[PDB]
């Protein structure tokens, strides 16, 4: 009897979504002048990693970098003189994600060891030490994002997400509802909500204090690999293995527009937005990062220069540089 | 160099020391043989680990090499989302229990055959050698003196004895390779045995030798 009620509720939600969308975003943006050809250049190339690079994150000063590779090393970059600030060894070399604290005093890492590790960067001893060892996930850590100091939001492969208190080291809120392995995270600009991408072609919006799933977004045909919020916080873009980027609307709760091309058949590893949100950068498996017009669904540039799978993407907070990490153990800063 | 202040020069020197330490760490890491350890839960994985939460890593050195055997059976999630992490391991050690042909989890032996097919034909391990371990010789002999292999494979036709049945299972497992010329598969029968370490050592030595030859274009 409950299955019939759930089906009726799903049909009602679908009908309510269908009783909307008087026009598409393409029709509205047809009056907008398209952006011309956009050609970034490899200003800096970062070397020192000897294995596949799976994660990077930009600092709040738009200058410091962190990169995670299968070397078991966490490297802090200067990105201006290509100097290495810190090299943090990892007890587990199977790292899959890394996060840089907004205050800049901490860095995070995690992966196949099911443990998110928090490291202290600014200590009296002058070296990077392990501050806390956050255990409690039964699956591999796929993404971690620092809400602020003493609070970390992590997603794991056991179809759940957890909000931790770093001082106590215990989970404060557990986010459940996904059926597949959650592989992505992105926080709102005000750190008020966040969205997750699981291996079930669905995305869910979560409330940090409430712990409840506000809205669920579908439409993808494969596993969602990366999600990134719009700069204004009212939208987000999802990348999946079906060679399709989709933009979702939080206030409207429908699929808004699709970023796809016939010549692309490979999966998408990372997505990112420009400072104004006009450019949607997406890293693919065809060794190239494609620049997408976020309003007109038109490819405006290609970041060719990586000879392996581009697994990482990142835009500085001032939106002036783009750093791409790939499996060829090279980081390239574009501008 | 002449346009750099003193602090910038000292930071550059620190970065160079970091570079040299990374090079030393990579050199030390390149002298360790990484090994995936796969197979069904019912297979004799435990005795293979006994040969001496998340990924379990094991160290052991036979003669002149250091081995890194990684267990992935503790993660009950989607394999394709993290199997690419192991691309570049010297070999994949696959354990199959010969006594599971007549059980069920849906035959267990055909379950392992599908798992072996999925691992072997995966795109991340196109040239990765597979060391296939066939466990429980004596239990298989006990179960084969009273029951045939026909209940497992109806097309099988042979006199019920250990040798031909073991050879037939081995050849069916080897025939799942769809790249026989480039990929090579080692097969070994084990039970109270102490020769597993020698077999793994020999298989790893070949793979290293064949990779050296494929990076030289000799053959």
């Amino acid at each position, epitope marked *: 009897q409950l299955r019939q009620e759930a089906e009726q509720l799903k049909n009602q939600i679908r009908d309510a979504r269908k009783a909307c969308a008087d026009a598409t975003l393409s029709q509205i943006t047809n009056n907008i002048d398209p952006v011309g050809r956009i050609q970034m250049r490899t200003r800096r190339t970062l070397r020192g990693h000897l294995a596949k690079i799976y994660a990077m994150h930009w600092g709040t000063d738009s200058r410091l970098l962190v990169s995670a590779s299968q070397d078991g090393k966490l490297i802090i970059w200067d990105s201006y003189t290509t*100097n290495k600030v810190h090299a943090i060894p990892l007890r587990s070399s199977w790292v899959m994600t890394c996060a840089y604290a907004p205050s800049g005093n901490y860095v995070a890492c995690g992966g196949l060891d099911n443990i998110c590790s928090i490291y202290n960067l*600014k200590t009296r*001893e002058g070296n990077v030490r392990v501050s806390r060892e956050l255990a409690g996930h039964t699956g591999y850590l796929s993404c971690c994002r620092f809400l602020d100091d003493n609070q970390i939001v992590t997603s794991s492969g056991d179809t759940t997400c957890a909000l931790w208190d770093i001082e106590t080291g215990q989970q404060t809120t557990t986010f459940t509802g996904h059926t597949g392995d959650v592989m992505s995270l992105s926080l709102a600009p005000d750190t008020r909500l966040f969205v997750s991408g699981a291996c079930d072609a669905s995305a869910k919006l979560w409330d940090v204090r409430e712990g409840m799933c506000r809205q669920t977004f579908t439409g993808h045909e494969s596993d969602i690999n990366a999600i990134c919020f719009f700069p204004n916080g009212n939208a987000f873009a999802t990348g999946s293995d079906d060679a399709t980027c989709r933009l979702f609307d939080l206030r409207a709760d429908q699929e808004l527009m699709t970023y796809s091309h016939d010549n692309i058949i490979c999966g998408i590893t990372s997505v990112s937005f420009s400072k104004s949100g006009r450019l949607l950068l997406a890293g693919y498996d065809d060794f190239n990062c494609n620049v997408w017009d976020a309003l007109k669904a038109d490819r405006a540039g290609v970041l060719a220069g990586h000879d392996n799978r581009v697994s990482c993407l990142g835009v500085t907070d001032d939106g002036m540089a783009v750093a791409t990490g790939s499996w060829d153990s090279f980081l390239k800063i574009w501008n | 160099g002449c346009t750099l202040s003193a602090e910038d020069k*000292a930071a550059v020197e620190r970065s160079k020391m970091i570079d040299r330490n990374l090079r030393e760490d990579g050199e030390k890491a390149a002298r360790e043989v990484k090994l995936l350890l796969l197979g069904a839960g019912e297979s004799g994985k435990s005795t293979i680990v006994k040969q001496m939460t998340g990924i379990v890593e094991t160290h052991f050195t036979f003669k002149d090499l250091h081995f890194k055997m990684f267990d992935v059976g503790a993660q009950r999630s989607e394999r394709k989302k993290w199997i690419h992490c192991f691309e570049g391991v010297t070999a994949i050690i696959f354990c199959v229990a010969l006594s599971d042909y007549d059980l069920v989890l849906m035959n267990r032996m055909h379950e392992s055959m599908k798992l072996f097919d999925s691992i072997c034909n995966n795109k991340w391990f196109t040239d990765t050698s597979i060391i296939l371990f066939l466990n429980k010789k004596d239990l298989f002999e006990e179960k084969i003196k009273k029951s045939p292999l026909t209940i497992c494979y109806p097309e099988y036709a042979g006199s019920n004895t250990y040798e031909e049945a073991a050879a037939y299972i081995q050849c069916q497992f080897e025939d799942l390779n769809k790249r026989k010329d480039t990929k090579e598969i080692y097969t070994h029968f084990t039970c109270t045995d102490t020769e597993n370490i020698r077999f793994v050592f020999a298989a790893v030595k070949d793979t290293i030798l064949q990779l050296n030859l494929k990076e030289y274009n000799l053959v």
Partner: single-chain antibody
Amino acid sequence: VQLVESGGGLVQPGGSRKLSCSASGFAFSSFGMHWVRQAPEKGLEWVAYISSGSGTIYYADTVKGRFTISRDDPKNTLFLQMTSLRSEDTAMYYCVRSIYYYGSSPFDFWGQGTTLTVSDIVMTQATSSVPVTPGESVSISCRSSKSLLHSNGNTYLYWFLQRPGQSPQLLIYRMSNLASGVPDRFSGSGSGTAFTLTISRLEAEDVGVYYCMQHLEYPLTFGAGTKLEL
């Protein structure tokens, strides 16, 4: 974080002495090390420097070819191999912990210091003694003969506090950044050659001699030292 020195004492002129410090509580191998000399007339003077890895060694143009600085990272120890000591070397030597990266604090910790007794950018401080009262706001100015603003945008200016009977400690590094462990009451400002250090309120622990240092280029030169009386 502790630096303890030994080896000082009375030495005949023209002889030799062997100073050393014992590092404890920090990763000594990752820190550059300086030797700073303070004469009995209360004047700081940089002497030598060794990098985190040996291979970058500098000396002031008064002891070069006469002083030898070495680092033994296994034992966490510095060394000064001083030869042919003269009467001008009678002073107190300090070892200064130092690190260099983006956002680092290169002059954080100083040693206790041992008294040794033997039987360039010019930084000027206008006032050598400013008698003031607690609870008021004061300003101390330092002037540089050459502009300290580099093309990177940084201004390598350092402020130090030396209480009577105590070792100097860092207050402001790069003219605008508060050191770790000091309150936000201290503030620093300047542009190019003119510099000013501002204090909101004076306490009993703020009485001492304030020093002014530049790190634009070697040799490192200290200021004359402004003493606050209250």
